[PDB]
Specification:
Length: about 210
Amino acid sequence: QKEEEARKVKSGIRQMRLFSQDECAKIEARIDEVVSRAEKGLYNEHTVDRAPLRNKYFFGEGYTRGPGQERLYPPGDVDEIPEWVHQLVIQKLVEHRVIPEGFVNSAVINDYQPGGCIVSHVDPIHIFERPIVSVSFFSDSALCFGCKFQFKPIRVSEPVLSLPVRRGSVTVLSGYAADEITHCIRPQDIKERRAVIILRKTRLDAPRL
Ligand SMILES: O=C(O)CCC(=O)C(=O)O
Ligand SMILES: [Mn+2]
């Protein structure tokens, strides 16, 4: 089951080292700008989610009381996907045939401090179409799958799979890896500042406030 679930997971994963060090550095400077702007109060209420070791910045579309009861906000509640995201990031993904033109209407920047993390979850299937596309910046890390170990540590202490995520790499989740298994990130795998950009398409018939 474990080696067999790893196979099934790997089946729904795709990765490309798509961004040079130089491109990563250009995008990383822009990510810093977004942090500065948020701090100057320039963004709408629901654009910035601040947690202790994790800040999240929602563009294009955002989502919210009850587990798996995520609801989209009136678009207009979150800020526009900025121009540098479109041109530095989404354009390159469109160019290299990772996703089609017009797919993306949601870009979320997660900014991680050292020892930051994200607990076990599935990207909510009722809000987002598949595939989920993520691009990494500032440093290398790892994305874990099958995150039972975070909650039941006597029985188990390793994930079903651990996937390295390099600076400048693109990770694309679908089928089994996006739908039938959790993913998470461990504090121990974020040794220095990491940021990731998550590019998604919301469902038309996604539930809404
Ligand atoms: O930080 C990452 O690479 C993944 C985070 C994540 O799974 C999410 O925000 O949906
Ligand atoms: Mn996720």
